[PDB]
Short mmCIF file of C-alpha atoms and ligand atoms in Angstrom, two decimals:
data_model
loop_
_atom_site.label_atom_id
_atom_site.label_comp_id
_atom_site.label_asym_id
_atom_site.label_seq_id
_atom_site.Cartn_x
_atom_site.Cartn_y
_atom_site.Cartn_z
CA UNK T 719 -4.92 -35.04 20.66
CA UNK T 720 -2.65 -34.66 17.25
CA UNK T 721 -1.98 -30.86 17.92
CA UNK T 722 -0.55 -30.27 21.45
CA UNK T 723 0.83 -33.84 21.20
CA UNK T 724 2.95 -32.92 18.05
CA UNK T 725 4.07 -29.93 20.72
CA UNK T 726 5.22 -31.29 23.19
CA UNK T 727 6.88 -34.05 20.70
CA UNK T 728 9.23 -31.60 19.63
CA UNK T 729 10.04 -30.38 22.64
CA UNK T 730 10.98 -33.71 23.39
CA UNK T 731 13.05 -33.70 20.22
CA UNK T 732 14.46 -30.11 20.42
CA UNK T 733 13.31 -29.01 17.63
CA UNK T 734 10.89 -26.49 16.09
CA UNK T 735 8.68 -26.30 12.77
CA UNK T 736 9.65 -24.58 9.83
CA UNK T 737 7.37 -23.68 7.16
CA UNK T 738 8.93 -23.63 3.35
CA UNK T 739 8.21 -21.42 0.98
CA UNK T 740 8.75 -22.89 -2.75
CA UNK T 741 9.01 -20.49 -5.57
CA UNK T 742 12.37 -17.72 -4.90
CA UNK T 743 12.86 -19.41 -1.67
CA UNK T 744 14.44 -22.34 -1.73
CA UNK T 745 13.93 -22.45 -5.99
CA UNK T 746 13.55 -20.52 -8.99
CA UNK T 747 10.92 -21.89 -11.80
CA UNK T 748 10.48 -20.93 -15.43
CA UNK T 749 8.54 -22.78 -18.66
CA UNK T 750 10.61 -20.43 -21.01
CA UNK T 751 11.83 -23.26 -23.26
CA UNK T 752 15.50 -21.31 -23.97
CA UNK T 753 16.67 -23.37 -20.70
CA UNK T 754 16.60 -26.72 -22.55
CA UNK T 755 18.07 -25.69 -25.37
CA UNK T 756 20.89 -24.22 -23.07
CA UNK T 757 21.06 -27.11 -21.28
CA UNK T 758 21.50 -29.59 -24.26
CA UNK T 759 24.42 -27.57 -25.16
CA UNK T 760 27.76 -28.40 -23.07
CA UNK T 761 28.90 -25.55 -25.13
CA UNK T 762 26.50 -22.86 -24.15
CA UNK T 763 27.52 -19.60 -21.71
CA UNK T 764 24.98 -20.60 -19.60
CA UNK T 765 25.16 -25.16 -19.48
CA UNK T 766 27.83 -24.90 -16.60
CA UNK T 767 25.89 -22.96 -14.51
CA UNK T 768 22.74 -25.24 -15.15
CA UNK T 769 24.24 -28.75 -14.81
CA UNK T 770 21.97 -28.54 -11.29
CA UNK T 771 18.97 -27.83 -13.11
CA UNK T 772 16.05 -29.97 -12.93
CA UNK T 773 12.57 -30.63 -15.04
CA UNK T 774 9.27 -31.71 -14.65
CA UNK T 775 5.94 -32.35 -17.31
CA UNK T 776 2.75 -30.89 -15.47
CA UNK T 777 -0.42 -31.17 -17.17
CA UNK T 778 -2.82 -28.07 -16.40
CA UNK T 779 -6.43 -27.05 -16.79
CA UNK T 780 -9.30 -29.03 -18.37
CA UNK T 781 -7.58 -29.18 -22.10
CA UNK T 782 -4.30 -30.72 -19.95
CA UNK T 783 -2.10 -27.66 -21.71
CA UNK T 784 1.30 -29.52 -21.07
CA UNK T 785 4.67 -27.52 -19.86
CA UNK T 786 8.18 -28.54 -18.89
CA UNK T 787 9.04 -26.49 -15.87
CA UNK T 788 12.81 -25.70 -15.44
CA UNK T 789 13.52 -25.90 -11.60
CA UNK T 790 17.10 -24.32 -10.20
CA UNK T 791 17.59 -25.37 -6.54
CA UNK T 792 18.71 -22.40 -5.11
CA UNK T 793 23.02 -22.82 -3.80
CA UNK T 794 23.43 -25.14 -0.91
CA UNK T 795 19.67 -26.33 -0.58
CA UNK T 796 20.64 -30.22 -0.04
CA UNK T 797 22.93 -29.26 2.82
CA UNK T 798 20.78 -26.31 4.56
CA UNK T 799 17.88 -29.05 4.76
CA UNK T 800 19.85 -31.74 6.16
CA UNK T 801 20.83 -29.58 9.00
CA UNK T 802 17.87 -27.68 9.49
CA UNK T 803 16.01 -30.28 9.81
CA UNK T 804 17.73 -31.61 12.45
CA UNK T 805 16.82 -28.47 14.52
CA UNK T 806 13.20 -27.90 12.79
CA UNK T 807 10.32 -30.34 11.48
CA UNK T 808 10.13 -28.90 7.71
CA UNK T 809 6.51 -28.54 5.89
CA UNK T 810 5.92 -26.99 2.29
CA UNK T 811 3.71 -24.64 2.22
CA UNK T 812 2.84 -22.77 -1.82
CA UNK T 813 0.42 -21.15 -3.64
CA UNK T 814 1.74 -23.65 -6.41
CA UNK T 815 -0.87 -26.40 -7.09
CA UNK T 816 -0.54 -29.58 -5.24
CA UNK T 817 0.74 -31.21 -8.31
CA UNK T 818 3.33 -28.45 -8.20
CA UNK T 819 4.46 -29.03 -4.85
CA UNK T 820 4.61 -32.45 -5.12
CA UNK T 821 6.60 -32.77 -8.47
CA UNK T 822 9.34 -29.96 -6.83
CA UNK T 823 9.27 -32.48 -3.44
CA UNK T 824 9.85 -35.17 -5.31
CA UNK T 825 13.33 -33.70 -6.94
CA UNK T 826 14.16 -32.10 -3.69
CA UNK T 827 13.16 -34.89 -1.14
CA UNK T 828 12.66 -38.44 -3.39
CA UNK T 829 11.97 -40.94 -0.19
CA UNK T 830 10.19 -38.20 1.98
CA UNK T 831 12.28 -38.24 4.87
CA UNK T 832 12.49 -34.50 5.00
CA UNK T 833 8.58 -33.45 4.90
CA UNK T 834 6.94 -36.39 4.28
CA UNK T 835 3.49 -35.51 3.65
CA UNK T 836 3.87 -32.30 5.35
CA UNK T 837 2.99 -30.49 2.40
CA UNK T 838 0.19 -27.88 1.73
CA UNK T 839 -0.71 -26.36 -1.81
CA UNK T 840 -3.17 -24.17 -3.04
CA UNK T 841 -5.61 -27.26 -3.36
CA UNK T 842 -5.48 -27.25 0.09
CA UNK T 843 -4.52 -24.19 2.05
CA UNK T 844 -7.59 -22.62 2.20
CA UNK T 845 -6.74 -19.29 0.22
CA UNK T 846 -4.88 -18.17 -2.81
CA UNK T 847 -4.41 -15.12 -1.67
CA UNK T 848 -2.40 -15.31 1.93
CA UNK T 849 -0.51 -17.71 4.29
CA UNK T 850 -1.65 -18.64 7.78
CA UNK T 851 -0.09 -20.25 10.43
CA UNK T 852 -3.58 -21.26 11.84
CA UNK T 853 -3.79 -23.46 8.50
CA UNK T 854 -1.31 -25.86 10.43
CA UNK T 855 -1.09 -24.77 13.93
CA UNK T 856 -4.87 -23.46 14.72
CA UNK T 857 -4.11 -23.32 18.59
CA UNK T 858 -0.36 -22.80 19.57
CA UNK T 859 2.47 -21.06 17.02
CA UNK T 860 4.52 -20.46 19.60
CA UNK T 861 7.19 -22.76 17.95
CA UNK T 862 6.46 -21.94 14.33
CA UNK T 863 9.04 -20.29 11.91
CA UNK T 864 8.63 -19.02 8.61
CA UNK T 865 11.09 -18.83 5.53
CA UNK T 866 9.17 -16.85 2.35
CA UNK T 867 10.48 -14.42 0.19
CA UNK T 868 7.11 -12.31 0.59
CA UNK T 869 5.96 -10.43 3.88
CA UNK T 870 2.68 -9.52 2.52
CA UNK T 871 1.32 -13.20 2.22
CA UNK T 872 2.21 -13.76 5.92
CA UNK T 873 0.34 -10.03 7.05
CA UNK T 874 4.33 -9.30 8.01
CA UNK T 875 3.54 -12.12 10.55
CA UNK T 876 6.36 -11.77 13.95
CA UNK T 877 7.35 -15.28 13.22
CA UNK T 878 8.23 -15.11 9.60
CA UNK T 879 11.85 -14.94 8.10
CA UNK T 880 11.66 -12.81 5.24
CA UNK T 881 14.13 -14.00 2.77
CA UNK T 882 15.86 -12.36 -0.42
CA UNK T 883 13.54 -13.08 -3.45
CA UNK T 884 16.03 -16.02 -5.71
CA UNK T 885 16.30 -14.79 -9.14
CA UNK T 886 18.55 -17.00 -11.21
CA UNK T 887 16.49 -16.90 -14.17
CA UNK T 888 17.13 -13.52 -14.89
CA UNK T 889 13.93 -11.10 -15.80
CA UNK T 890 11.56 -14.25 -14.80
CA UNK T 891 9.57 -13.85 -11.14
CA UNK T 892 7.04 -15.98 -9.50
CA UNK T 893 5.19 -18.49 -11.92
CA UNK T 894 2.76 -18.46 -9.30
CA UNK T 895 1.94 -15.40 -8.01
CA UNK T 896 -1.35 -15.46 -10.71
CA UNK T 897 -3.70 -14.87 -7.58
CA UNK T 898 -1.55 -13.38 -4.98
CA UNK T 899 -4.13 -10.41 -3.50
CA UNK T 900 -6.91 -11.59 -5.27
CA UNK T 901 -10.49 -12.54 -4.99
CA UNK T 902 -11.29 -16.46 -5.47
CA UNK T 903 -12.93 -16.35 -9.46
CA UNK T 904 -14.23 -19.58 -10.79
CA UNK T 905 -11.91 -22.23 -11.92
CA UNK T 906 -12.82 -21.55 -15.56
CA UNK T 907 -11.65 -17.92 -15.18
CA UNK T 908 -8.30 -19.25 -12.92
CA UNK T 909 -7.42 -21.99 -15.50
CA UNK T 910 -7.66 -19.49 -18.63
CA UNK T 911 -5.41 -16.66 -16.72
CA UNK T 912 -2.97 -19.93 -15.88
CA UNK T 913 -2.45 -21.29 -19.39
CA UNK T 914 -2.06 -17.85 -20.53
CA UNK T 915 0.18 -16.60 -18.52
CA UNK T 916 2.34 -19.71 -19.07
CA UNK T 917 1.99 -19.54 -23.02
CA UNK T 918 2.90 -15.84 -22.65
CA UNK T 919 6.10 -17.01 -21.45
CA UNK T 920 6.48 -19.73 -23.58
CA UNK T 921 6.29 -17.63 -26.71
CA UNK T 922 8.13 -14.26 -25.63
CA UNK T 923 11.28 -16.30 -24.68
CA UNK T 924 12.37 -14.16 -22.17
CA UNK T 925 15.79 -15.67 -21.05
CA UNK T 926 16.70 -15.66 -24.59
CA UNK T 927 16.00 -11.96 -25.92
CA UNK T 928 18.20 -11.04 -22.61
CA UNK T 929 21.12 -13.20 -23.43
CA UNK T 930 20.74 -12.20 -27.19
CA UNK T 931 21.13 -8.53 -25.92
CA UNK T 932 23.86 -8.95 -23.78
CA UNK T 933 26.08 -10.58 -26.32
CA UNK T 934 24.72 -8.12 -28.87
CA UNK T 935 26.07 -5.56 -26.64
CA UNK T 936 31.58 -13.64 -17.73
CA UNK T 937 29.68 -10.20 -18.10
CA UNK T 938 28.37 -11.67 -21.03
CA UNK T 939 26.52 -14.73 -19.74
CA UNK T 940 23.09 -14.08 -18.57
CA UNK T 941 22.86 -16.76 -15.93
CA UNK T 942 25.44 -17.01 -12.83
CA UNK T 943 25.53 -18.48 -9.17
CA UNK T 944 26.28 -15.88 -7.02
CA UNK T 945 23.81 -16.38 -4.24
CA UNK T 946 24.54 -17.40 -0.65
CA UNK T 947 21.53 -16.53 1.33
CA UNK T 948 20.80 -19.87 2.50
CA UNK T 949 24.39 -19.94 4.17
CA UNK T 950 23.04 -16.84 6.07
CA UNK T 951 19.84 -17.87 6.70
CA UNK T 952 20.85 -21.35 8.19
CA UNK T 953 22.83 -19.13 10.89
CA UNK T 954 19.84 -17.22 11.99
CA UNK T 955 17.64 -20.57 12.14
CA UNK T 956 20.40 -22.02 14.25
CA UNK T 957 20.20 -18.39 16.52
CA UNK T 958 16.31 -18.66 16.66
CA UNK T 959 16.53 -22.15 18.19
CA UNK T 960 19.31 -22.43 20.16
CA UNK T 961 17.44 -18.67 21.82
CA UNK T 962 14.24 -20.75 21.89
CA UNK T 963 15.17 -23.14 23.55
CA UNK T 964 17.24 -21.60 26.47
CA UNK T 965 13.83 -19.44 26.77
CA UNK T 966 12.09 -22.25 27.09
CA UNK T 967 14.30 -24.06 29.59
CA UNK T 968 14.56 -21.32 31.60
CA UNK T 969 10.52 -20.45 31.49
CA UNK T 970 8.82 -23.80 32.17
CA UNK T 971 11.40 -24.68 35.02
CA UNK T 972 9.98 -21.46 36.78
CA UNK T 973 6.65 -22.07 36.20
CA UNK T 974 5.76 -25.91 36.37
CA UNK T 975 6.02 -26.13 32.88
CA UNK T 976 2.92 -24.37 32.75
CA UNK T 977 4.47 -21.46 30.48
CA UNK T 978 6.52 -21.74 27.38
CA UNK T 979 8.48 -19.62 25.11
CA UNK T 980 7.20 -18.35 22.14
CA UNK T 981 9.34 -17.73 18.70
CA UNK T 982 6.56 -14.94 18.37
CA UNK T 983 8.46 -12.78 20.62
CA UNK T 984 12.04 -13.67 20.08
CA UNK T 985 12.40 -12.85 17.07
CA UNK T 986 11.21 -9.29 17.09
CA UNK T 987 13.67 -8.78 19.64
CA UNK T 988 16.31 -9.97 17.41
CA UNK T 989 15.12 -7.93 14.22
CA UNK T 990 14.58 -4.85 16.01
CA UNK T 991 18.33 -4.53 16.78
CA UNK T 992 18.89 -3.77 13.05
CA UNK T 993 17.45 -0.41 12.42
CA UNK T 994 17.03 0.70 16.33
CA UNK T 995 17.16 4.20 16.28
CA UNK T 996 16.64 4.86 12.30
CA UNK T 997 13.59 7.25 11.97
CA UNK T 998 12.87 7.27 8.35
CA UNK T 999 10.97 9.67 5.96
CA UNK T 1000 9.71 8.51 2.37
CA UNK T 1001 10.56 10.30 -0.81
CA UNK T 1002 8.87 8.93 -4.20
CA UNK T 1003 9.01 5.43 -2.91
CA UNK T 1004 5.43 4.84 -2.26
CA UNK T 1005 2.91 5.72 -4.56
CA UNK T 1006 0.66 9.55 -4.33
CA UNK T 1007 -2.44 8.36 -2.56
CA UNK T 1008 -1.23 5.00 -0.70
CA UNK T 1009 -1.08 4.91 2.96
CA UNK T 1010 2.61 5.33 4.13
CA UNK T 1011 2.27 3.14 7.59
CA UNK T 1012 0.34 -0.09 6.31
CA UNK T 1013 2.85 -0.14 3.23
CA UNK T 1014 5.10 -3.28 2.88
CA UNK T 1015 8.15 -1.24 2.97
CA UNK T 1016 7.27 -0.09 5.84
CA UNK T 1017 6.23 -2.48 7.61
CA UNK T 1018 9.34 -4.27 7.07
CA UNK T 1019 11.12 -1.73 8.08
CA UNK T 1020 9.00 -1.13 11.07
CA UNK T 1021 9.60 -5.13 11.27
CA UNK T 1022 13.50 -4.63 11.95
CA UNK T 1023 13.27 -1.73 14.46
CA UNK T 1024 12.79 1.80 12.40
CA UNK T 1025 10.19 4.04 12.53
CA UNK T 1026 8.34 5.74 9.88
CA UNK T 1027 7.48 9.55 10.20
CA UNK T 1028 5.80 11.11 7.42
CA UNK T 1029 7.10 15.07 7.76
CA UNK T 1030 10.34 16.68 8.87
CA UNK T 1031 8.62 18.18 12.44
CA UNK T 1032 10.61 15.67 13.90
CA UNK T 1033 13.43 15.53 11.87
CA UNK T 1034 14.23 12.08 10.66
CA UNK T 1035 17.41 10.15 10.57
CA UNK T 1036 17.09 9.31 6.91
CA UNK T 1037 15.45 10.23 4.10
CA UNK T 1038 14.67 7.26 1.85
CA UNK T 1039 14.36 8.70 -1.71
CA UNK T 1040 13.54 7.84 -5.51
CA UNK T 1041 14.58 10.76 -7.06
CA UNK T 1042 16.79 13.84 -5.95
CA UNK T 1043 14.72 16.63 -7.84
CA UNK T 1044 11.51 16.64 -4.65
CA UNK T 1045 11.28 19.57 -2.13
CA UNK T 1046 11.80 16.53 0.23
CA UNK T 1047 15.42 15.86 -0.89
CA UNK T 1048 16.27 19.67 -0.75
CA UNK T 1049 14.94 20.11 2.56
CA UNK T 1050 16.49 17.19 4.22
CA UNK T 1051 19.96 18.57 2.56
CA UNK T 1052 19.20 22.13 3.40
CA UNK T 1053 18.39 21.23 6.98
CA UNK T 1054 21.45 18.89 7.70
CA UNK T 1055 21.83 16.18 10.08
CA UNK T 1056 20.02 13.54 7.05
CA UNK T 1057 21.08 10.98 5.66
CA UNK T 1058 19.79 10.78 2.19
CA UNK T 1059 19.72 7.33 0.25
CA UNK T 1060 18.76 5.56 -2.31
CA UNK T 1061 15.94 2.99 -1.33
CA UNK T 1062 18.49 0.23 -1.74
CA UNK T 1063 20.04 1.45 1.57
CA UNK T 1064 17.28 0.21 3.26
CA UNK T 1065 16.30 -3.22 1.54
CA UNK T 1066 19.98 -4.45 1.30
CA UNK T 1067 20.07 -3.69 5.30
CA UNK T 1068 16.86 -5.67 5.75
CA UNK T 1069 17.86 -8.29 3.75
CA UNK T 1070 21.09 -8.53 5.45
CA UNK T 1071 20.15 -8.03 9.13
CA UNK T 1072 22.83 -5.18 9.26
CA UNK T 1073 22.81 -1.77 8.04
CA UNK T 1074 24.95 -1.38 5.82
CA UNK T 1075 27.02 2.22 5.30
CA UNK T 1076 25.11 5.12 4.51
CA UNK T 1077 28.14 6.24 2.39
CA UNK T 1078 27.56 3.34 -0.09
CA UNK T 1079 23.79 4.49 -0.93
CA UNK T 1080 24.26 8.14 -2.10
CA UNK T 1081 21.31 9.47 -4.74
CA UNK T 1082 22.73 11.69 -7.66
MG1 MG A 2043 7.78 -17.28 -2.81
#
């Protein structure tokens, strides 16, 4: 009964469900040690701009290696959950461990009004390798929305929100992209790459040998807040819901309430405005040998409306390059009528729903 009761429950409530990505979503992790230092220091570069920060002890693999993860909450998180979640039902849903999860939940959500116990982990998800929405909605997603900074762990899913990866702690990534791709090894096998990785990072002190070089050389701070994509992202929830449910008001009146609308197909419809009419050849971008269509790029492009030709016999609208010395680049000059760009044209339009000039993404 759970499943298409908890449907028609938000109906009732107006809302929809949002599954949460963790790490470069809605935070940014490291273990690199140089953050506590900074942060015991009112008079470091960086202590104003992690005042925010906060840090957990997690206890990992069968020798209980210890680390204190640094977690920055990425610029106007507290508010953009309040009010989304008074349009969506929020879940978690990482490839962090459940202990993971739950120690970020507990900074982020302390009494659990927010997700509750709507929270799914590697322990628990069924893969390290990809997301599905069948995980928590087997039957009916036609209400689901996703917010992750990765396309390729949802199979560029029609219902996901790609997001702009959060990098505050400069040169660090994903702490938890160990398995991302991969094939399931044993535990042993997972729990030695783990502790290694995380010793690796430990040791090399990333954040510090980049602020050591810059002020060897704010301009000379390593860490700022300059990010606003939740502010932007909170405006296309509020789209994607208020579209919902006018859809849906207008499609079961007409049929009984025997049909529904389905987040599935709006939001295509609102991506593919973005590059609609952008037919766009590769240059150096994806690697000799790899299949141009099924890339991520593309796909993503694809996602937001362009399409993807692989030769000039149609000529294309842009030419996406990596470097200006290929026969591509001097053909798509010498023929005229192409726009050639850096691939930066295209990922800052896709990340910004809105292409941005042409003019600002010149190779030399
Ligand atoms: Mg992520």
């Amino acid at each position: 009964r759970l499943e298409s009761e908890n449907v028609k429950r938000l109906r009732q409530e107006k809302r929809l469900s949002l599954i949460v990505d963790l790490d470069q979503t809605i935070i940014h992790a490291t273990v690199d040690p140089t953050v506590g230092e900074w942060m015991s220091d009112p008079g470091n570069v960086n202590y104003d701009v992690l005042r925010d920060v906060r840090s957990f002890n997690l206890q990992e693999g069968p020798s209980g290696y210890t680390s204190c993860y640094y977690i920055k909450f990425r610029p106007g998180l507290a508010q953009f959950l309040q009010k989304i979640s008074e349009l969506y039902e929020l879940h978690i849903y990482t490839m962090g461990t459940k202990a993971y999860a739950k120690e970020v939940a507990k900074i982020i959500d302390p009494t659990g009004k927010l997700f509750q116990d709507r929270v799914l982990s590697a322990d628990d998800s069924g893969s390290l390798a990809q997301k599905s929405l069948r995980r928590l909605f087997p039957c009916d997603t036609s209400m689901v929305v996703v917010i992750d900074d990765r396309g390729d762990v949802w199979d560029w899913n029609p219902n996901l929100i790609k997001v702009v990866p959060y990098e505050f702690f400069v040169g660090i990534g994903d702490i938890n992209s160990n398995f991302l791709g991969s094939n399931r090894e044993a535990l042993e096998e997972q729990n030695k790459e783990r502790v290694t990785a995380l010793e690796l990072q430990k040791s090399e002190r990333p954040l510090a040998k980049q602020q050591n070089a810059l002020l060897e050389d704010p301009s000379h701070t390593l860490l700022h807040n300059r990010d606003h994509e939740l502010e932007r992202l909170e405006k296309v929830l509020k789209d994607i819901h208020a579209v919902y449910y006018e859809e849906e008001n207008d499609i079961s009146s007409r049929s009984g309430n025997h049909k529904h609308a389905n987040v599935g197909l709006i939001i295509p419809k609102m991506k593919q405005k973005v590059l609609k009419g952008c037919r766009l050849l590769f240059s150096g971008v994806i690697p000799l040998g790899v299949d141009v269509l099924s890339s991520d790029i593309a796909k993503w492009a694809m996602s937001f409306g362009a399409e993807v030709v692989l030769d000039f016999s149609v000529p294309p609208t842009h030419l996406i390059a990596a470097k200006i010395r290929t026969e591509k680049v001097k053909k798509a000059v010498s023929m005229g009528n192409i726009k050639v760009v850096k691939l930066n044209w295209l990922t800052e339009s896709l990340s910004q729903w809105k292409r941005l000039p042409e003019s600002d993404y010149l190779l030399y």
